[PDB]
Write an enzyme that holds these catalytic residues in place. Structure first.
Site, PDB file in Angstrom:
ATOM      1  N   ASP A 121      -3.276   4.757  -1.251  1.00  0.00           N
ATOM      2  CA  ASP A 121      -3.978   3.512  -0.969  1.00  0.00           C
ATOM      3  C   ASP A 121      -4.526   3.547   0.455  1.00  0.00           C
ATOM      4  OD1 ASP A 121      -3.490   2.233  -3.460  1.00  0.00           O
ATOM      5  OD2 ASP A 121      -1.644   1.255  -2.653  1.00  0.00           O
ATOM      6  N   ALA A 152       0.823  -1.196   0.000  1.00  0.00           N
ATOM      7  CA  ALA A 152       0.000   0.000   0.000  1.00  0.00           C
ATOM      8  C   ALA A 152       0.869   1.262   0.000  1.00  0.00           C
ATOM      9  CB  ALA A 152      -0.873   0.067   1.233  1.00  0.00           C
ATOM     10  N   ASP A 153       0.482   2.154  -0.903  1.00  0.00           N
ATOM     11  CA  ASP A 153       1.176   3.450  -0.963  1.00  0.00           C
ATOM     12  C   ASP A 153       0.322   4.494  -0.242  1.00  0.00           C
ATOM     13  OD1 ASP A 153      -0.800   4.286  -2.832  1.00  0.00           O
ATOM     14  OD2 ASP A 153       0.564   4.041  -4.581  1.00  0.00           O
ATOM     15  N   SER A 154       0.720   5.760  -0.236  1.00  0.00           N
ATOM     16  CA  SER A 154      -0.002   6.681   0.637  1.00  0.00           C
ATOM     17  C   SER A 154      -1.428   6.902   0.146  1.00  0.00           C
ATOM     18  CB  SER A 154       0.764   7.995   0.759  1.00  0.00           C
ATOM     19  OG  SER A 154       1.880   7.646   1.589  1.00  0.00           O
TER      20      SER A 154
END
Ligand SMILES: C[As](C)(=O)[O-]
Ligand code: NA
Ligand SMILES: [Zn+2]
Ligand SMILES: [Zn+2]
Ligand SMILES: [Zn+2]
Ligand SMILES: [Zn+2]
Ligand SMILES: [Zn+2]
Ligand SMILES: [Zn+2]
Ligand SMILES: [Zn+2]
Length: 77
Positions: A38, A34-36
Protein backbone atom coordinates in the site's frame (compact mmCIF):
# COMPACT_ATOMS: atom_id res chain seq x y z
CA UNK A 1 -12.59 19.73 -5.14
CA UNK A 2 -9.72 21.07 -3.11
CA UNK A 3 -6.32 19.42 -2.91
CA UNK A 4 -7.18 18.26 0.63
CA UNK A 5 -10.33 16.59 -0.71
CA UNK A 6 -8.56 15.01 -3.68
CA UNK A 7 -5.65 13.71 -1.62
CA UNK A 8 -8.07 12.21 0.93
CA UNK A 9 -10.12 10.62 -1.87
CA UNK A 10 -7.04 8.95 -3.36
CA UNK A 11 -5.95 7.68 0.06
CA UNK A 12 -9.38 6.25 0.84
CA UNK A 13 -9.60 4.56 -2.55
CA UNK A 14 -6.07 3.09 -2.44
CA UNK A 15 -6.31 1.84 1.13
CA UNK A 16 -9.98 0.66 0.99
CA UNK A 17 -10.83 2.97 3.91
CA UNK A 18 -13.98 5.03 4.40
CA UNK A 19 -13.70 8.81 4.05
CA UNK A 20 -14.79 9.55 7.62
CA UNK A 21 -11.77 7.49 8.77
CA UNK A 22 -9.32 9.51 6.67
CA UNK A 23 -8.73 12.22 9.26
CA UNK A 24 -6.00 14.75 8.64
CA UNK A 25 -3.84 13.46 11.49
CA UNK A 26 -4.34 9.79 10.58
CA UNK A 27 -1.25 7.59 10.17
CA UNK A 28 -1.29 5.53 7.01
CA UNK A 29 0.19 2.53 8.75
CA UNK A 30 -1.04 3.07 12.34
CA UNK A 31 -4.59 4.24 11.63
CA UNK A 32 -5.48 3.44 8.01
CA UNK A 33 -4.17 -0.16 7.89
CA UNK A 34 -1.62 0.41 5.13
CA UNK A 35 0.51 -2.62 4.41
CA UNK A 36 3.86 -2.55 2.64
CA UNK A 37 2.45 -2.76 -0.88
CA UNK A 38 0.00 0.00 0.00
CA UNK A 39 2.78 2.39 0.83
CA UNK A 40 4.31 2.23 -2.67
CA UNK A 41 0.95 2.13 -4.45
CA UNK A 42 -0.27 5.17 -2.52
CA UNK A 43 2.81 7.15 -3.52
CA UNK A 44 2.25 6.06 -7.13
CA UNK A 45 -1.43 7.08 -7.04
CA UNK A 46 -0.62 10.53 -5.64
CA UNK A 47 2.17 11.01 -8.21
CA UNK A 48 -0.18 10.14 -11.05
CA UNK A 49 -3.14 12.20 -9.75
CA UNK A 50 -1.05 15.36 -9.27
CA UNK A 51 1.62 14.85 -11.95
CA UNK A 52 4.40 15.18 -9.45
CA UNK A 53 7.33 13.07 -8.28
CA UNK A 54 7.76 12.19 -4.62
CA UNK A 55 11.38 11.25 -3.79
CA UNK A 56 11.46 8.02 -1.79
CA UNK A 57 13.45 9.63 1.11
CA UNK A 58 10.50 11.99 1.51
CA UNK A 59 7.90 9.31 1.12
CA UNK A 60 9.58 7.46 4.05
CA UNK A 61 8.71 10.39 6.29
CA UNK A 62 5.25 11.01 4.77
CA UNK A 63 3.49 8.99 7.40
CA UNK A 64 0.21 10.91 7.91
CA UNK A 65 -2.60 12.20 5.76
CA UNK A 66 -1.58 15.80 6.52
CA UNK A 67 1.99 15.10 5.43
CA UNK A 68 0.68 13.97 2.02
CA UNK A 69 -1.66 16.95 1.70
CA UNK A 70 1.14 19.34 2.58
CA UNK A 71 3.54 17.75 0.10
CA UNK A 72 1.01 17.93 -2.76
CA UNK A 73 -0.05 21.50 -1.89
CA UNK A 74 3.59 22.49 -1.71
CA UNK A 75 4.65 21.02 -5.10
CA UNK A 76 1.93 22.16 -7.49
CA UNK A 77 2.03 21.16 -11.14
C1 LIG B 1 -11.38 5.29 -11.34
AS1 LIG B 1 -12.07 6.75 -10.20
C2 LIG B 1 -13.81 6.01 -9.52
O1 LIG B 1 -11.23 7.50 -8.87
O2 LIG B 1 -12.45 8.18 -11.16
NA1 NA C 1 -13.68 17.89 3.54
ZN1 LIG D 1 -11.84 8.33 -7.37
ZN1 LIG E 1 -11.91 1.29 8.05
ZN1 LIG F 1 -2.92 7.84 14.83
ZN1 LIG G 1 4.91 8.22 -12.05
ZN1 LIG H 1 3.10 8.13 -14.65
ZN1 LIG I 1 2.35 11.05 -15.83
ZN1 LIG J 1 7.40 8.83 -10.14
Amino acid sequence: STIEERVKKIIGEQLGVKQEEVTNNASFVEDLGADSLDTVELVMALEEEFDTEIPDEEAEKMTTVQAAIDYINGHQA
